[PDB]
Nucleic acid binder design. Structure first.
Ligand SMILES: [Mg+2]
Ligand SMILES: [Mg+2]
Ligand SMILES: [Mg+2]
Ligand SMILES: [Mg+2]
Ligand SMILES: [Mg+2]
Lengths: 171, 72, 137, 191, 234, 197
RNA sequence: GGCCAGCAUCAGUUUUGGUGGCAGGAUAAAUCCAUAGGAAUGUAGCUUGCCUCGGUAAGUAUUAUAGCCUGUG
RNA sequence: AGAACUGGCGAUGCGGGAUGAACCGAACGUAGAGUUAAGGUGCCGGAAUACACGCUCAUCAGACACCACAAAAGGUGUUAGUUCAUCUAGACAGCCGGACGGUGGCCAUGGAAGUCGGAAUCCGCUAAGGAGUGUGUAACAACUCACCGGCCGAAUGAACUA
RNA sequence: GCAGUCAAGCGUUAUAGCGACAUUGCUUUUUGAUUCGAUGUCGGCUCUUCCUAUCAUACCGAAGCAGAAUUCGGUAA
RNA sequence: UUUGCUCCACACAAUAUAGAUGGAUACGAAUAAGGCGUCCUUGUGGCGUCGCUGAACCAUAGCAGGCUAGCAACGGUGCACUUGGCGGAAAGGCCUUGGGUGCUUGCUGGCGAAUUGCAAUGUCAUUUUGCGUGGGGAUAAAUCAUUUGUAUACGACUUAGA
């Protein structure tokens, strides 16, 4: 669906002589909190030796974009599950929000790489402060000063089956 | 300009069901060969990631901290 | 007359300061300004005078208007409001035949039945005068 | 990729007027006029000054920008054609049977008539395309000159003349008779 | 896909990297301290036997070639990056195919040698014609009429396609010999030469033009001044 | 909204036009299609010609006169496209097909009638620019239709007459618009403007 | 009183709208305001080259005759 | 192919998969109303020629069974990745110039000079230049390219993956 | 076909194990010399059509293809 | 085959079935371009203006549209005539002259409507192989049977005969 970002903080169950186990936080992109918690347990078991049965979720909070009406460039570092192994991929996405950039990235992985949400891992989404660190041409072409472009061949949606006039594509 | 015969793409029931049996046999054979065979069993930071230096500095500081975390 | 001549084909341009009219969604029929370009298919718009919130919108949801005004790139909502008022975008829009067609459509949709009767009577009177003028000339 | 905007420049000299409308290019120069239909290609022409014309593609791909460079080359060839002309010199050679090349008029249609190619009784007739002039070289043996404004017309006429005299069923290591393009160039040689 | 495919050759020599530029840079900056006079020489279109003869005649000195930007960076491009005081003037005086002569001899002796050194050379394009040459009528010979045809040997037939296409000379093969129907004038004296005419003259072996080193200026180590020489700069 | 809808087939795409016309006929609308020779099929001319030669391959082996009947005219090509989208072996399907007429050119009486377009089937609105397309007249001529030149000459004559008619109508439009302008300053016109007319 | 219907007020099931009062979260994040810094896809101004009566190319210049970004409240 | 356990079908209609023993839904008194499953919504055909981000043009695309043809092979189609390298003391492409000296290195041949062959393949001067990458000559010549420089001026090349 | 050799890849930190392309041995040796068990269905005549995996006819490309003739290949029923 | 046949008007008569219920309301071409208006030195010209849907334009008030009085104007509109021109793609229609005869809601007045009972399509639009009135126009063929043989199984074909 449309993505939200959550911080999920969990821990092992306290035992005898071991109070206050270490708290682990993870940033998860998901459609809702049930999916977010599921992905968190998946990664915690994949990385450490912690199971959902032996642990608990301490906190889960939605994280909002700080400046959702500011256009930013994002470097996205991902890796996808494969027979040859984990494969790094770096992409650049221009958008106003991290969740919008991640939604674009998932749609793009489905379109080009034929990849699914369960197969894609997000390693890091970072905002590029300076425009000189942008290094993909399909993003750098939109960083030109006084950028103006037209939209040739305008196709207007018709509400009726028949039109009494030949259409125009002018804009 | 003589046009030849084109192969039909209409599905055949017998072929479809036979391919189903073929695929099940193939998967079972592959699983058996996987349980039988004797063949021995971290790409890191991408070169185009801009904050490579920050990632490396953080991993080095983490290593230095973890070196003394377990000792004391 | 020995100079080359090439036809121009003036296109309305996607650029900062371009006035757009929104055609579908929560703010349909309202004017906003393009504040920044995201990509070929999406821009950022702000509509502070009309009540359009600052938002990223798809270009398939607005129509570019011929109007444009001076605007810094990425300018915040209050600055957009100030520059919009200074450029007097609303008046230049209201003077257009596009805006008049919109308002005429709304008034015709808002007429009552008694008013439609009045309209027919007036049309008949105007028709009588126009035909009489058309006979002499 | 889908580049946002890709453009090329076309330089217009002083004696040349270019009129472009709905992708029909007319170039008028000291040697005459040429016309081209470019309506099979989506481009936009813009006038920057009297000496410069831009041709541009918006939101194009690889095939589109390849067409853009093709368009620029074609219009430049028109400008060269109306300002300097095009001139192809051909030579016809033979071993034993002399080749007879003349200009003949069949109802005022202006054919090049080629006779006695390897002793053939067949008369080969190559029509002259419109706008192409045929001259026979003075004080040069067995040379034809094809001249005109349209390089496409001149080079296609030269190709027709070269292909009408193919050697058939014979070893071409041995049999060398034919008509061959010997030089491609311009008409005017002010410098 | 659809890109130009580079040709692959199996030869015995590899390319030079940045290390050779650094090596020549080091040699320049060492010779600046070692020798006293640094002369800037222009040596465009010079032949290697001539250059090696020059190096031999200046035994005990140093002649250094290389990339002009490398030489200028070694001498110092600007005032704050120069290797020695007021060397940037000599550095910016370099142009074209540049050689540096590090020496210890007298200014008069270096000037006299470079004023008196001259050798016969092929005529380059965009140069004045030193003579008016014409291939004589009939069978084309190797020298093309400079020596008598009885001494001269006829031109080999393998050069006929080169003469016909590249030089645009009307030639025909008769009995394995290259023949022209009429005399062919190649160049008239005092006329600017293009690539085609220069190639024709080089093919026939006519060397009437003169070669001479150009001397721009020199820099003195202890005096720390540059003096414009203006030798053969006409 | 008309009893009879006259559709100008020029510049339309065959399948999308056939789909809309089939649905309109089944809902009970009378449709006349004119200028079937200027219709378009997406794809390059050799592709569409190859498809027609595949159709020409099809025939009943023991008696060719029983087989699929290969009509070469552009109107019949469009009719085949449409009949494939109508359930034509039922009485309802036949009754629907009998609400349609298809013509090459614009014969009388339709030449003095209004002709409309279908925007969801128009080539300049549907095809991405640069994609190749075929024209039905050339396709029909290559596969055996023999009346392209006759229809072209008749279309030229009709265009001359229609152009003269439009010149007269335009002059009258100018006169009526002029005389209507000078009544815009009266109280009646002000009241009409207040009401929206 | 036999046949077929219309409207109103209800009951059972259900479908489709308008509108109000509340509660949570970073007690939304934003916008907006104030303040402290900062940079360019460098605003005004100033220098120079030589340019269609000043419109430009390249340096300085951080708010100025535009503005933007970050933290804090 | 031999064992063991568990389902489905025969005795069983209904919706869908165009059609159908084992496929996807769902099991059945007679009706009405509402809502769905699986599958679908250009037209045949009830239901958006809906909205959104990308990819693809096939001289018989694809809308299929995830088995085979299939060598993860071939391709100067096109898109996105990854890892290496070169680069304003000058990227790639082009044009021009240099491309030398001992030396026609030794043996061999009627001839054989880098370039029919067999073995060595060195030394000097360099900015660089093979006892020579090919064209060429009866042998030389000439051309070439390996390599270097001048002009030009900002990105480029190679191998892999999807 | 069997047995081997090489090594682009696959594989991996344990030079184990797979493995395309190439390649060797046997079959099969040097001077162009000098019929061996189908165990169960086959063929005519008349007449039509289809495939192309083309023998001829048409047009092309390559070859020491002089010419003549031939060989190999492409489109083509 | 007891005046058969066909049209031109005035009465009665019946009728209007893949679906009337204000009007199918005519440039052409382009779409990386056009429409309209205006001006010039008439062109690939200058200037202006339009689109972003027909949500239009034209019609549209009166017992399903009655009866009457005026005012303003020389218009609009129906019918039957008549003047001329054009249309062959299946023209069967488009334009036009003149007078006559009705209406006109362009504006101001005076009478009428009811009871179909609170809705029930509440019946409204061309052509008419029918008849009675009539003034005008035109008075044929084909087949069987007989016959020929250019034909032929039979039919059919092709000939001939007041
Ligand atoms: Mg209720
Ligand atoms: Mg439907
Ligand atoms: Mg097979
Ligand atoms: Mg074949
Ligand atoms: Mg009344």
């Amino acid at each position: 669906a449309h993505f939200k970002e959550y911080q999920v903080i969990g821990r092992r169950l306290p035992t005898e002589s071991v109070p206050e186990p270490k708290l682990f936080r993870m940033r998860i992109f998901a459609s809702n909190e049930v999916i977010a918690k599921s992905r968190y347990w998946y990664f915690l078991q994949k990385l450490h030796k912690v199971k959902k049965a032996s642990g608990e979720i301490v906190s889960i909070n939605q994280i909002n974009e700080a400046h959702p009406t500011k256009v930013k460039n994002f470097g996205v570092w991902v890796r996808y599950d494969s027979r040859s192994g984990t494969h790094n991929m770096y992409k650049e996405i221009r958008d106003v929000s991290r969740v919008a950039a991640v939604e674009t990235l998932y749609q793009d992985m489905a379109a080009r790489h034929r990849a699914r949400f369960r197969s894609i891992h997000i390693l890091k989404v970072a905002e590029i402060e300076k425009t000189a660190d942008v290094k993909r041409q399909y993003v750098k072409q939109f960083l030109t000063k006084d950028l103006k472009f037209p939209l040739p061949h305008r196709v207007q949606k018709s509400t009726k089956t028949f039109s009494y006039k030949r259409p125009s594509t002018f804009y | 300009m003589r046009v030849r015969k084109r192969q039909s793409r209409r599905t055949s029931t017998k072929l479809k069901e036979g391919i189903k049996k073929k695929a099940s046999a193939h998967r079972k054979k592959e699983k058996k060969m996987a349980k039988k065979d004797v063949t021995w069993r971290d790409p890191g930071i991408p070169s185009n990631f801009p904050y490579k230096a920050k990632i490396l500095e953080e991993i080095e500081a983490k290593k230095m901290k973890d070196l003394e975390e377990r000792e004391l | 007359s020995t100079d080359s001549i090439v036809k121009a084909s003036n296109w309305r341009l996607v650029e900062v300061g371009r006035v757009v009219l929104i055609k579908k969604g929560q703010s349909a029929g309202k004017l906003a300004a393009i504040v920044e370009i995201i990509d070929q298919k999406k821009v950022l718009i702000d509509g502070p005078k009309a009540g359009v919130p600052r938002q990223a919108i798809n270009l398939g949801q607005v129509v570019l208007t011929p109007l444009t005004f001076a605007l810094p790139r990425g300018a915040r909502t209050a600055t957009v409001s100030k520059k919009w008022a200074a450029a007097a975008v609303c008046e230049k829009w209201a003077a257009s035949s596009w805006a008049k067609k919109i308002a005429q459509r709304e008034r015709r949709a808002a007429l009552t039945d008694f008013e439609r009767f009045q309209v027919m009577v007036l049309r008949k009177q105007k028709r009588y005068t126009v035909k009489k003028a058309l006979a002499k000339a | 990729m889908k580049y946002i905007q890709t453009e090329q420049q076309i330089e217009v000299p002083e004696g040349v007027t270019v009129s472009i409308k709905s992708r029909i290019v007319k170039v008028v120069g000291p040697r005459g006029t040429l016309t081209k239909n470019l309506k099979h290609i989506d481009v936009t022409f813009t006038k920057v000054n009297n000496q410069l014309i831009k041709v541009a593609v918006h939101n194009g791909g690889r095939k589109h920008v390849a067409a853009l460079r093709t368009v620029k080359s074609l219009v430049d060839n028109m400008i060269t054609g109306v300002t300097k002309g095009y001139k192809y010199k051909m030579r016809y050679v033979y071993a034993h049977f002399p080749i007879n090349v003349n200009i003949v008029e069949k109802d005022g249609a202006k054919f090049i008539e080629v006779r006695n190619f390897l002793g053939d009784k067949k008369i080969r007739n190559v029509p002259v395309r419109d706008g192409v002039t045929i001259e026979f070289s003075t004080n040069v043996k067995d040379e034809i000159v094809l001249s005109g404004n349209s390089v496409e017309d001149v080079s296609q006429n030269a190709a027709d003349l070269q292909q009408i005299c193919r050697v058939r069923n014979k070893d071409i290591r041995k049999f060398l008779d034919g008509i061959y393009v010997s030089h491609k160039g311009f008409i005017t040689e002010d410098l | 896909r659809s890109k130009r495919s580079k040709l692959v050759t199996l030869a015995q020599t590899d390319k030079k990297g940045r290390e050779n530029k650094e090596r020549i840079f080091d040699e320049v900056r060492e010779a600046l301290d070692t020798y006293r006079y640094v002369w800037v020489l222009h040596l465009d279109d010079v032949r290697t036997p001539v250059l090696q003869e020059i190096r031999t005649s200046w035994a005990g000195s140093k002649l250094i070639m290389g990339k002009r930007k490398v030489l200028q960076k070694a001498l110092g491009e600007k005032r704050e990056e120069e290797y020695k005081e007021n060397l940037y003037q000599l550095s910016k005086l370099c142009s074209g195919v540049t050689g540096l002569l590090f020496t210890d001899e007298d200014v008069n002796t270096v000037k006299e040698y470079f004023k008196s050194y001259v050798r016969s050379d092929y005529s380059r394009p965009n140069t004045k014609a030193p003579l008016t040459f014409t291939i004589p009528e009939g069978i084309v010979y190797s020298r093309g009429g400079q020596i008598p045809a009885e001494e001269d040997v006829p031109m080999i037939h393998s050069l006929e396609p080169t003469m016909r296409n590249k030089f645009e000379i009307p030639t025909k093969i008769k009995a394995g010999k290259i023949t022209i129907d009429s005399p062919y004038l190649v160049c008239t004296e005092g006329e600017k030469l293009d690539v085609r005419q220069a190639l024709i003259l080089k093919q026939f072996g006519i060397a009437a033009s003169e070669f001479k080193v150009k001397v721009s200026a020199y820099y003195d180590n202890d005096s720390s001044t540059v003096e414009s020489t203006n030798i053969n700069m006409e | 909204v008309e009893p009879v809808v006259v559709i100008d087939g020029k510049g339309h795409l065959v399948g999308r036009l056939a789909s809309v016309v089939a649905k309109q006929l089944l809902n009970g609308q009378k449709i006349v299609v004119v200028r079937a020779e200027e219709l378009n099929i997406s794809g390059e001319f050799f592709r569409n010609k190859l498809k027609y030669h595949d159709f020409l391959r099809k025939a009943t082996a023991f008696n060719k006169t029983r087989g699929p009947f290969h009509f070469r005219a552009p109107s019949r090509i469009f009719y085949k496209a449409l009949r494939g989208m109508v359930s034509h072996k039922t009485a309802r399907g036949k009754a629907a097909l009998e609400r349609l007429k298809v013509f090459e050119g614009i014969p009388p009486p339709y030449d003095k009638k209004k002709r409309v377009v279908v925007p969801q089937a128009l080539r300049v609105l549907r095809l991405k620019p640069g994609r190749k397309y075929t024209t039905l007249g050339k396709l029909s001529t290559s596969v055996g239709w023999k009346y392209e030149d006759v229809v072209a000459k008749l279309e030229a004559k009709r265009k001359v007459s229609s152009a003269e008619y439009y010149a007269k109508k335009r002059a009258f439009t100018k006169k009526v618009a002029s005389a209507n302008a000078t009544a815009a300053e009266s109280d009646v016109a002000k009241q009409l403007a207040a009401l929206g007319y």
